[PDB]
Write an enzyme that holds these catalytic residues in place. Structure first.
Site, PDB file in Angstrom:
ATOM      1  N   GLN A  42       5.014   5.026  11.501  1.00  9.31           N
ATOM      2  CA  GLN A  42       4.189   5.721  12.519  1.00  9.31           C
ATOM      3  C   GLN A  42       4.929   6.947  13.071  1.00  9.31           C
ATOM      4  O   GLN A  42       4.252   7.834  13.615  1.00  9.31           O
ATOM      5  CB  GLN A  42       3.828   4.736  13.631  1.00  9.31           C
ATOM      6  CG  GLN A  42       2.896   3.626  13.167  1.00  9.31           C
ATOM      7  CD  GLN A  42       1.534   4.184  12.835  1.00  9.31           C
ATOM      8  OE1 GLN A  42       1.180   4.359  11.669  1.00  9.31           O
ATOM      9  NE2 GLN A  42       0.771   4.501  13.870  1.00  9.31           N
ATOM     10  N   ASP A  53       0.878  -1.205   0.000  1.00  6.25           N
ATOM     11  CA  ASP A  53       0.000   0.000   0.000  1.00  6.25           C
ATOM     12  C   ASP A  53       0.904   1.240   0.000  1.00  6.25           C
ATOM     13  O   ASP A  53       1.868   1.238  -0.793  1.00  6.25           O
ATOM     14  CB  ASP A  53      -1.060  -0.044   1.107  1.00  6.25           C
ATOM     15  CG  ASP A  53      -2.291   0.801   0.803  1.00  6.25           C
ATOM     16  OD1 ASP A  53      -2.375   1.327  -0.332  1.00  6.25           O
ATOM     17  OD2 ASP A  53      -3.160   0.931   1.699  1.00  6.25           O
TER      18      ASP A  53
HETATM   19  N1  LIG Z   1       1.750  -3.041   4.725  1.00 11.55           N
HETATM   20  C1  LIG Z   1       1.153  -2.938   5.921  1.00 11.55           C
HETATM   21  N2  LIG Z   1      -0.030  -2.325   6.028  1.00 11.55           N
HETATM   22  C2  LIG Z   1      -0.546  -2.274   7.289  1.00 11.55           C
HETATM   23  C3  LIG Z   1       0.073  -2.796   8.433  1.00 11.55           C
HETATM   24  C4  LIG Z   1      -0.798  -2.529   9.546  1.00 11.55           C
HETATM   25  C5  LIG Z   1      -0.598  -2.884  10.984  1.00 11.55           C
HETATM   26  N3  LIG Z   1       0.149  -4.125  11.143  1.00 11.55           N
HETATM   27  C6  LIG Z   1       0.337  -4.530  12.523  1.00 11.55           C
HETATM   28  C7  LIG Z   1       0.480  -6.032  12.590  1.00 11.55           C
HETATM   29  C8  LIG Z   1       1.405  -6.374  13.466  1.00 11.55           C
HETATM   30  C9  LIG Z   1       1.957  -5.156  14.151  1.00 11.55           C
HETATM   31  O1  LIG Z   1       1.351  -4.973  15.421  1.00 11.55           O
HETATM   32  C10 LIG Z   1       1.644  -4.040  13.158  1.00 11.55           C
HETATM   33  O2  LIG Z   1       1.433  -2.781  13.784  1.00 11.55           O
HETATM   34  C11 LIG Z   1      -1.881  -1.875   9.043  1.00 11.55           C
HETATM   35  N4  LIG Z   1      -1.726  -1.696   7.680  1.00 11.55           N
HETATM   36  C12 LIG Z   1      -2.722  -1.098   6.813  1.00 11.55           C
HETATM   37  O3  LIG Z   1      -3.104  -2.131   5.926  1.00 11.55           O
HETATM   38  C13 LIG Z   1      -3.265  -1.627   4.582  1.00 11.55           C
HETATM   39  C14 LIG Z   1      -2.295  -2.348   3.669  1.00 11.55           C
HETATM   40  O4  LIG Z   1      -0.977  -1.816   3.745  1.00 11.55           O
HETATM   41  C15 LIG Z   1      -3.100  -0.103   4.692  1.00 11.55           C
HETATM   42  O5  LIG Z   1      -4.379   0.507   4.813  1.00 11.55           O
HETATM   43  C16 LIG Z   1      -2.277   0.096   5.970  1.00 11.55           C
HETATM   44  O6  LIG Z   1      -2.568   1.327   6.605  1.00 11.55           O
HETATM   45  C17 LIG Z   1       1.336  -3.444   8.293  1.00 11.55           C
HETATM   46  O7  LIG Z   1       2.003  -3.952   9.217  1.00 11.55           O
HETATM   47  N5  LIG Z   1       1.822  -3.476   6.991  1.00 11.55           N
END
Ligand SMILES: Nc1nc2c(c(CN[C@H]3C=C[C@H](O)[C@@H]3O)cn2[C@@H]2O[C@H](CO)[C@@H](O)[C@H]2O)c(=O)[nH]1
Length: 323
Positions: A303, A228
């Site tokens: 973040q 993304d």
């Molecule tokens: N590529 C990616 N995208 C993530 C995430 C996350 C949160 N992932 C959590 C999973 C394990 C940890 O606690 C991380 O904080 C949200 N998103 C959301 O998912 C979608 C795909 O990227 C977008 O809308 C991001 O904002 C990520 O880790 N990688």
């Protein structure tokens, strides 16, 4: 190579030909050396802001969450109050679902989802500004519920059971059944396969179930990065992704980039391989992580970037189909 979804294979063809985006493998080596020096490790799974419950309802929560997990940007900025904290972006999404379920809204019930309306979700996600693509998230939640009801007896547990602890087989089962999740594109007349929301869904189940029961998967190594807009913003910040002049200016001017356009496909393809080249280089320096872990670790860094980093690319996510 394996690659039974063909995300690596197809995206590799884009990176090789790409004109507006390229990987700086010198920067990859420098960052790998540093991340490996302080033997860094990814976040666990932030189960403060994620709803918790029994097998059947939780597996449905994950599918719902990733069904509307997209495009959080636009002015005025969309913010959410929850339990004394104000949230934006992906965390606003998860809090909004925790709040709703906790106020007794049956977002894990197929029957409710199939019928859910513009009004319902407007309120589920109410706060400062409005969540983008409000109507499209309504349609996708209806579409998600109907498919759950028809093909899986209202239980995503049944779909997961069918996967037989293969992450790769589950993504296939998901995209075959749920039209919203079919994330592919073309580049110079060739299909490029990404499966962003489908692939992250598998990683979220692994997180929510501590790699046991419905979150048990024997081939997480096969997942790619979830292409993304945050992870490429971080890879650019870390010097791993370079943008050519016209694209650098678009991003800096916060100009929207049409979905499935060469420049957009180049950024996503480079994000997949940016993460993969970083995984290989970390592995070479005795720090073995899975691709989804390097992605989790990078999204984490996203973040808390310094102000004045190049803005993330802005793409109005499209799926206006299934008629
Ligand atoms: N590529 C990616 N995208 C993530 C995430 C996350 C949160 N992932 C959590 C999973 C394990 C940890 O606690 C991380 O904080 C949200 N998103 C959301 O998912 C979608 C795909 O990227 C977008 O809308 C991001 O904002 C990520 O880790 N990688």
């Amino acid at each position: 190579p394996g690659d039974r979804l063909g995300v690596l294979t197809t995206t590799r063809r884009v990176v090789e030909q790409a004109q507006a985006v390229w990987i700086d493998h010198d920067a990859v080596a420098q960052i790998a050396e540093a991340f490996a020096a302080r033997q860094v490790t990814p976040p666990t799974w932030n189960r403060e802001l994620h709803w918790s419950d029994g097998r059947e309802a939780l597996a449905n929560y994950i599918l719902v969450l990733d069904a509307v997990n997209f495009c959080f940007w636009g002015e005025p900025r969309w913010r959410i109050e929850y339990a004394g904290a104000v949230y934006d972006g992906y965390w606003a999404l998860a809090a909004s679902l925790k709040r709703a379920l906790e106020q007794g809204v049956p977002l894990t019930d197929a029957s409710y989802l199939a019928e859910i309306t513009r009004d319902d979700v407007a309120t589920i996600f109410a706060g400062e500004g409005e969540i983008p693509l409000l109507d499209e998230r309504a349609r996708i939640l209806r579409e998600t519920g109907s498919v759950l009801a028809e093909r899986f007896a209202g239980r995503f547990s049944d779909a997961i059971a069918a996967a037989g602890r293969s992450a790769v087989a589950l993504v296939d089962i998901v995209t075959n059944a749920f039209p919203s999740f079919r994330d592919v594109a073309t580049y110079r007349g060739e299909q490029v396969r990404f499966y962003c929301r489908a692939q992250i869904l598998v990683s979220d189940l692994y997180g929510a179930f501590d790699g046991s029961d419905l979150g048990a998967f024997d081939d997480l190594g096969e997942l790619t990065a979830f292409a993304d807009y945050k992870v490429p913003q971080v890879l650019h910040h870390l010097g791993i992704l370079r943008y050519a002049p016209a694209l650098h200016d678009r991003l800096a001017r916060r100009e929207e980039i049409p979905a499935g356009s060469p420049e957009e496909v180049e950024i996503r393809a480079a994000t997949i391989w940016g993460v993969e080249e970083l995984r290989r280089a970390l592995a070479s320096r005795g720090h073995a992580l899975d691709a989804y872990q390097v992605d989790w670790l990078l999204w984490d860094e996203g973040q808390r970037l310094p102000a004045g980093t190049l803005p993330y690319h802005r793409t109005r996510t499209i799926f206006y189909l299934e008629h």
